[PDB]
Design an enzyme around this catalytic site. Structure first.
Site, PDB file in Angstrom:
ATOM      1  CB  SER A   1     -15.985  -3.756  92.023  1.00 49.73           C
ATOM      2  OG  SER A   1     -15.107  -3.095  91.129  1.00 49.73           O
TER       3      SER A   1
ATOM      4  CG  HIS B   1     -11.626  -2.933  93.956  1.00 46.78           C
ATOM      5  ND1 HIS B   1     -12.920  -3.396  94.024  1.00 46.78           N
ATOM      6  CD2 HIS B   1     -11.136  -3.364  92.774  1.00 46.78           C
ATOM      7  CE1 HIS B   1     -13.215  -4.036  92.907  1.00 46.78           C
ATOM      8  NE2 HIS B   1     -12.148  -4.035  92.134  1.00 46.78           N
TER       9      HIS B   1
HETATM   10  C1  LIG Z   1     -14.010  -0.307  90.648  1.00 51.08           C
HETATM   11  C2  LIG Z   1     -15.186  -0.245  89.689  1.00 51.08           C
HETATM   12  C3  LIG Z   1     -15.422   1.180  89.224  1.00 51.08           C
HETATM   13  C4  LIG Z   1     -14.961  -1.165  88.501  1.00 51.08           C
HETATM   14  C5  LIG Z   1     -14.240  -2.465  88.826  1.00 51.08           C
HETATM   15  N1  LIG Z   1     -13.795  -3.112  87.597  1.00 51.08           N
HETATM   16  C6  LIG Z   1     -13.097  -2.486  86.648  1.00 51.08           C
HETATM   17  O1  LIG Z   1     -12.250  -1.634  86.895  1.00 51.08           O
HETATM   18  C7  LIG Z   1     -13.391  -2.887  85.208  1.00 51.08           C
HETATM   19  C8  LIG Z   1     -12.688  -4.207  84.874  1.00 51.08           C
HETATM   20  C9  LIG Z   1     -12.265  -4.329  83.432  1.00 51.08           C
HETATM   21  C10 LIG Z   1     -13.053  -5.005  82.517  1.00 51.08           C
HETATM   22  C11 LIG Z   1     -12.665  -5.114  81.192  1.00 51.08           C
HETATM   23  C12 LIG Z   1     -11.487  -4.545  80.766  1.00 51.08           C
HETATM   24  C13 LIG Z   1     -10.697  -3.869  81.660  1.00 51.08           C
HETATM   25  C14 LIG Z   1     -11.084  -3.759  82.985  1.00 51.08           C
HETATM   26  N2  LIG Z   1     -12.989  -1.825  84.312  1.00 51.08           N
HETATM   27  C15 LIG Z   1     -13.626  -1.591  83.167  1.00 51.08           C
HETATM   28  O2  LIG Z   1     -14.826  -1.783  83.006  1.00 51.08           O
HETATM   29  C16 LIG Z   1     -12.783  -1.099  82.032  1.00 51.08           C
HETATM   30  C17 LIG Z   1     -13.175  -1.339  80.728  1.00 51.08           C
HETATM   31  N3  LIG Z   1     -12.457  -0.918  79.686  1.00 51.08           N
HETATM   32  C18 LIG Z   1     -11.343  -0.253  79.979  1.00 51.08           C
HETATM   33  C19 LIG Z   1     -10.956  -0.011  81.278  1.00 51.08           C
HETATM   34  N4  LIG Z   1     -11.664  -0.433  82.323  1.00 51.08           N
HETATM   35  B1  LIG Z   1     -15.149  -3.488  89.716  1.00 51.08           B
HETATM   36  O3  LIG Z   1     -14.653  -4.886  89.554  1.00 51.08           O
HETATM   37  O4  LIG Z   1     -16.570  -3.391  89.292  1.00 51.08           O
END
Ligand SMILES: CC(C)C[C@H](NC(=O)[C@H](Cc1ccccc1)NC(=O)c1cnccn1)B(O)O
Ligand SMILES: CC(C)C[C@H](NC(=O)[C@H](Cc1ccccc1)NC(=O)c1cnccn1)B(O)O
Ligand SMILES: CC(C)C[C@H](NC(=O)[C@H](Cc1ccccc1)NC(=O)c1cnccn1)B(O)O
Ligand SMILES: CC(C)C[C@H](NC(=O)[C@H](Cc1ccccc1)NC(=O)c1cnccn1)B(O)O
Ligand SMILES: CC(C)C[C@H](NC(=O)[C@H](Cc1ccccc1)NC(=O)c1cnccn1)B(O)O
Ligand SMILES: CC(C)C[C@H](NC(=O)[C@H](Cc1ccccc1)NC(=O)c1cnccn1)B(O)O
Ligand SMILES: CC(C)C[C@H](NC(=O)[C@H](Cc1ccccc1)NC(=O)c1cnccn1)B(O)O
Ligand SMILES: CC(C)C[C@H](NC(=O)[C@H](Cc1ccccc1)NC(=O)c1cnccn1)B(O)O
Ligand SMILES: CC(C)C[C@H](NC(=O)[C@H](Cc1ccccc1)NC(=O)c1cnccn1)B(O)O
Lengths: 192, 43, 178, 178, 196, 196, 178, 192, 196, 189
Positions: I96, I121
């Site tokens: 990620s 991803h």
């Molecule tokens: C693919 C890369 C860019 C990021 C991936 N993770 C995410 O998408 C993360 C996982 C997550 C964490 C908390 C709340 C919602 C979602 N996305 C976010 O940081 C995030 C945070 N707030 C709203 C929307 N997405 B990975 O697991 O690092």
């Protein structure tokens, strides 16, 4: 809530100022970890001077039997006479440690209560009846060993200990002097 | 001290014994009276 | 069940019970019982015995609308406790037919609720809380015959009534003493 | 049960209740009751009393389809609360036969939901959320006779209606005052 | 994990974080959610750095989801109070209350890294405040006072009308770094300065 | 997270966190809820700073959501006992007990920040205290003892009648800093002193 | 159910049971049973067997009002335990018809409750706790024939009674010994 | 938050600076661990100077009875006079420790609360009726000992302590001076 | 357990863990999940290592499952900001956000050890974001903004089109070390330099 | 409890300054980052002295495994893996990952090898699960080829052995090829 005088030198809280004056403190329950602490202090104070009396303060609710006999054996082992002082309560296993002091040196504060009771299992020990026959011969051995320990130190018959520790016997300080658990009730030393 | 850059997202990071100053030797432990009585530095 | 059997036999005698908090489940079965009993006889009174700690306003407004729109009179009976929505539905009975049993207690107070969400959501909730509280106080003023300013001041916190105090205030019309 | 017995006797009088949140369980039994009552008589109206805080769109769309496809008219009755899917099904009744009881409240707002999963999943969910919200606003515009832009602006957050305000807006056709 | 040694010198148990190194160069770090304990920390550091040198600029790094309003206005007032100008730098995100602190820097000194986001929205109540309708009318006049105060704060720092902040913070308004420059939250999308 | 700096004072190389540095400049910090463990801290600091110099003013920063009444009156009595004048500054909220401690400062020396919140309300029991009606008659005469004592306290410090405090603290009376200056909780809104 | 079947067959013999804590559910079904049995025969006594640890005052006041307002006598029977509201309803029976089974125990004590909320709310709760406790002691003084100061002093903490002690004190009128 | 300030090498909080000025601080509930702390501090300060008095600050909701009598007996044991000052509240055991100070030296702040009540049991103690009649003879031993203890120190009859501690007798500072728990409502020393 | 070995330094004695021993050698561990507190730590390390020598290359060892997108772009922008070149070395996994930070090293200086996993991803919402459909269309346009930004970020570091990243990151495109070199996330499968 | 002895320091400091990295916890990302920090410290202290790795681990995650595995193979120092009590799952791969001739085991140490597992259930669409299952076969094949190059056995022989839990003793792991010598006791009595 405890004033620590911190310091690369010694920390010196009031429990260090108890331990340097050869006062071992038992104020928590007698579990393994506290018994391990007490035996480490009993040996260290024996090695610092085996002739000066170790004082043991007992404000404990009591606890496990093997942790009891861990402290008990180390109190009886060391060359220093153990001065046991009851603070507030010496219940369960801690009444046995209170009686385990050196004769003449077993003290209690006037409103310290001494609770003697037979051993109990913490919770329920499950198992087959052959497993439970072993566990019940064990707590009967723990009961008999506690009674003969209090027989050695209170000067009573172990059958008298058995009849008295059938239920919770709470003794006051004067009632524990008459019983034999402590030797003197401490008089107040205040100059007022 | 020689290499004391600015730190972070703000100030610029472009702003042996031969680069020695008494600011280094006071940090070492030489008192500033002792250093000014030693005007010459050999390295 | 036995408890349902006794309630069914009292439903046959046109005696219904508000005996719980007024949630939507108890309200819908009371509205169903009032619709059922007004369909059987439109001229025989329904006795509504109320032992209620109060409940939802909209659930009790469903009952109150079904009570008013029933062609038969709804005799209400404060039985032990007529608190909050239970005092409302007690006082919502047909005038002349609102009864307190002599050791019932009536608790009139302003609506409780909860604000949550964003500030634009809470501004809507508070706007609607002002609408609900003005409408609940208007009807308690209409039921009891008290001024709406009297209902506003008295419902500000919990105001308890005995049966005799609720008779003077206007929630009930009679105290049953048999 | 007693509560099922009163509902069964009102099912015999073609009176059905949307009294809970519109989930799939309450929707399927209402769809079953509308299919059962339209099979008995295809010409006698079904009275749908609605005391509902709203619920699932697809559950209420099951009810709304069963209401429209029933050959008999579905008289809807706002009883206390016709919120969300409950105002929809209220306004989904046969025109001329949508009723608000005079202290019922109607809550019209846009659909709530939840996004979850991967970004490709959420792009599909949002695409479908735009389809659901456009279709829910189209039908509320069709029901109430309001413009769809009026429904869009008003449903943006919670918009509350009294019975008289819901009559003017178009959710109901009459306010019952007996 | 954070690499940090303890020098002792028989005078202390002296800790050395990279945050201690940043704070020596007058960088206050808002990297957690703005709650009371965070706001208490940030205000204590703003007043220390005002006392150490009230002329040199305090830098405030903001990587924060944003939190409580009174904790926000605690930090906000202490920012606006101290004689030092405040360089706010957005790291990653400045959401809710932290975008208000990001706009609360000294004009010309509000920065954001190019892929930082700036999330502005109206105040909320996390959870349900129960109570009588007289209690809730108080709590809702409060959340409108919090909303109006946040908008007039973002009005005086972005150069927008407070009614424009109303229509923009009706939902989540996520800005990029460049979109927050056009909006007025930051003044500079901070360029990369790598050698290669 | 709280970065720690180094002070080159008469000694130098002295590691200090911003809270030790506030306390060195006689600033007691009430940022947590007023409970017993917090009140125990503040009273210890009020007596240390009275002992270090009883003539210099102790400053009390208040970012507290307020709390226990006996913890309130523990801090209150110690603020009133010490020979040093107490300068209360509100930073963010002063709610419940905290606004009483905010009003408890020396007249002329009670400050807030321009976006600080002052929330006064009557005492409440946290959760249900159960028992016999003779027990509850004691506990209810006790919270009326607490309610009267809070209003008597706010009457001494705001200059209002205790019945006026009783009508105002019926619900949550939230004051801003300019509204708490006119009320008498503070008497200085403390204009910002930034050089730009 | 079997348990409901035995209770239904004893309801046919006008024998009802207060066998649980007196909450609003047990009170409303007892009030329903007293209203049902007084509707069947207004001249045959209702036997109320009480095995109760006590309960809500307002729930037991609902029962006590339904007992008094019933045109038929309510013979009460202390069966094992009559504590708190259960001794009250025991002593609330028709005089001459209050019975203790010879190993029943009667527990008279002052009401328990809980204070919560703001100081203005608790001042109202305490004001109402003084009203409830004065009214509960007035009725226990009326039932037992004891002075109200005797009831106040004795109910201050738990006061236990045997059957013979409750007969002397006045809760029951006879000890059944068959 | 609790700050510190470096004295001279050593790092001291305000609790150290209190304790070096013979001030013991009872600021939490009286359980075993707090009573163990207080008794250690009482013996350290007596050893440092048994003639310079010990001050005990009491901001405490009270607690366990054996932990109470552990502090109580140690306060009465030490040669130094105990100056008890009530800070905010002294409830239950804390009020008994407040009254336990040296006569003439028992203070309270003007808005301090003094709450006295009979001992209780936290929750239900299960057991056979022989176990329970011993636990109830124990809570009667604890009740009588507390009322005797408040009779030594308030100068009142223990039967009058018994009638007053039937419910929560909640005293203000002026009401606790008239009662006998404190001797001086400590007036403010503000220069302004 | 982590052994904190002692180094006899100028200031009395210095006690250091293995992380600070490596931080003295421009070595950063992204070894935890990329959340705010991790990103806060890495940005503080990257700036401190820039100010000590902005021309000595920083090594960022990455063993991370990845995490938050703004915590990702906080580390990302700080890696791209600093004057020092970043040498990203993947250990075990870079999943990620961590694979984006692995690709975010200086070109020619992005390594992975031979058995390191590289997982890319599209960003996902952990848990379910509730709300009205106007709230969710904001949250969905945001995760499309996050998805597009991550694909744009992996475009200029892997040298691919952002559409090619979009077809690949539809599912978990899991790469080995040699597959990530052909993809463009790393530049060198780092050979083992063991002397036997 | 762990008694220390300062300036002679706890026993883990004394092991580490004598170049003994300790793995006694389960292999997760936290313990991997600790070991890889220690492997890179001891490589930078002297790359020509052997690093000793003690393994009392129940094993753990695969990417945490191959993080430690790669760093053990990466450092210039020779890794001396000693098994202490157990080396289960991932930790038996690290035990085999020592320098040949320098893989010890205590005589009553357990060596447990098994194929990779997913702890718990990974939900998802069947295309998500087709990825996750080709991944656990990537992990299985990589673990078997890792144990192939360190035990001298064919990777298909590793695959048949790790069908279930193949628990080896110390002597059975010597004959298997995971350790090179079973460490004899050297007590003077
Ligand atoms: C693919 C890369 C860019 C990021 C991936 N993770 C995410 O998408 C993360 C996982 C997550 C964490 C908390 C709340 C919602 C979602 N996305 C976010 O940081 C995030 C945070 N707030 C709203 C929307 N997405 B990975 O697991 O690092
Ligand atoms: C009577 C004396 C010997 C000790 C009392 N209890 C026991 O006998 C203790 C029970 C106990 C109580 C409190 C905490 C921990 C353990 N007995 C044992 O330790 C024990 C352990 N294993 C088997 C049988 N008994 B005391 O702790 O109440
Ligand atoms: C009837 C009024 C005047 C007094 C009380 N009723 C309420 O305020 C009730 C209590 C309740 C019941 C069920 C679920 C949630 C809340 N409040 C409401 O129903 C309510 C609250 N806010 C807006 C609309 N309705 B009663 O139930 O104590
Ligand atoms: C008139 C409109 C607003 C109807 C409203 N419906 C919804 O928002 C409901 C609330 C709900 C109910 C059950 C389970 C999950 C969610 N939303 C949906 O059913 C929904 C949400 N997203 C996509 C498709 N349907 B009502 O329930 O507020
Ligand atoms: C938009 C700015 C002003 C702040 C945003 N949210 C708020 O306004 C916050 C949300 C929040 C956070 C923590 C605890 C309780 C409530 N509002 C408040 O702090 C708050 C506190 N008490 C009453 C009313 N609002 B942010 O945190 O999303
Ligand atoms: C308004 C001032 C006096 C204080 C406010 N509330 C109170 O009075 C507080 C609320 C509170 C806080 C913590 C734990 C329990 C109760 N009241 C008390 O401390 C209290 C304590 N014991 C009995 C009665 N009241 B504040 O905490 O909201
Ligand atoms: C004869 C007297 C003592 C009757 C007693 N009643 C009470 O104390 C009951 C116990 C109870 C039951 C249900 C829910 C809450 C509380 N108390 C009340 O009902 C009660 C309490 N405060 C005000 C008004 N009613 B009995 O239950 O002990
Ligand atoms: C009134 C004074 C003497 C003491 C008060 N508290 C007590 O009575 C405490 C409360 C308590 C705590 C734990 C377990 C059981 C009971 N009583 C005791 O310490 C106690 C302990 N064992 C048996 C009987 N009572 B008070 O709250 O400090
Ligand atoms: C056999 C060796 C290679 C490793 C063994 N364990 C594994 O295979 C571990 C067990 C595990 C842990 C967390 C989540 C899922 C699975 N496998 C993994 O690390 C793993 C993690 N995510 C996806 C696929 N495999 B063993 O138990 O240490």
């Amino acid at each position: 809530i405890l004033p620590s005088f911190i310091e690369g030198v010694k920390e010196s809280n009031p429990y260090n100022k108890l331990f340097e004056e050869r006062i071992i403190f038992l104020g928590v329950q007698v579990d393994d970890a506290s018994a391990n602490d007490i035996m480490a202090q009993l040996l260290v104070l024996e090695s610092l001077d085996p002739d000066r009396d170790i004082t043991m303060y007992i404000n404990s609710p009591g606890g496990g039997f093997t942790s009891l006999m861990a402290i008990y054996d180390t109190m009886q082992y060391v060359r220093a006479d153990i001065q046991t002082v009851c603070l507030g309560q010496a219940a369960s296993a801690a009444a046995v440690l209170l009686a385990a002091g050196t004769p003449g040196k077993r003290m209690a504060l006037p409103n310290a209560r001494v609770l003697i009771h037979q051993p109990s299992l913490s919770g329920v020990i499950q198992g087959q009846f052959s497993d439970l026959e072993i566990q019940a011969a064990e707590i009967e051995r723990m009961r008999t060993l506690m009674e003969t320990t209090l027989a050695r130190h209170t000067g009573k018959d172990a059958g008298v200990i058995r009849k008295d520790t059938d239920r919770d016997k709470i003794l006051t300080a004067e009632e524990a002097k008459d019983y034999g658990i402590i030797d003197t009730v401490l008089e107040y030393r205040k100059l007022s | 001290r020689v290499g004391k850059r600015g730190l972070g997202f703000g100030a610029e990071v472009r702003s042996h014994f031969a680069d020695v100053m008494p600011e280094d030797l006071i940090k070492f432990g030489l008192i500033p009276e002792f250093i000014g009585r030693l005007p010459v530095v050999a390295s | 069940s036995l408890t349902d059997s006794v309630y069914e036999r009292l439903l046959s005698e046109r005696i219904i019970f508000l005996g719980s908090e007024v949630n939507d489940e108890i309200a819908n079965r009371l509205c169903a019982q009032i619709l059922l009993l007004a369909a059987e006889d439109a001229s025989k009174d329904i006795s509504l015995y109320i032992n209620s700690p109060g409940g939802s306003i909209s659930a009790g407004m469903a009952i109150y609308d079904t009570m008013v729109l029933a062609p038969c009179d709804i005799a209400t009976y404060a039985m032990g406790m007529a608190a909050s929505m239970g005092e409302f539905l007690l006082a919502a009975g047909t005038k002349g037919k609102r009864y307190a049993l002599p050791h019932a207690r009536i608790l009139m107070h302003q609506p409780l609720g909860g604000v949550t969400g964003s500030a634009a959501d809470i501004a809507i909730q508070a706007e609607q809380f002002a609408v609900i509280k003005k409408e609940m106080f208007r009807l308690n003023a209409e039921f009891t015959g008290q001024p709406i300013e009297r209902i506003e001041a008295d419902s500000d916190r919990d105001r308890w009534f005995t049966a005799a105090e609720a008779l003077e205030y206007g929630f009930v019309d009679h105290i049953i003493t048999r």
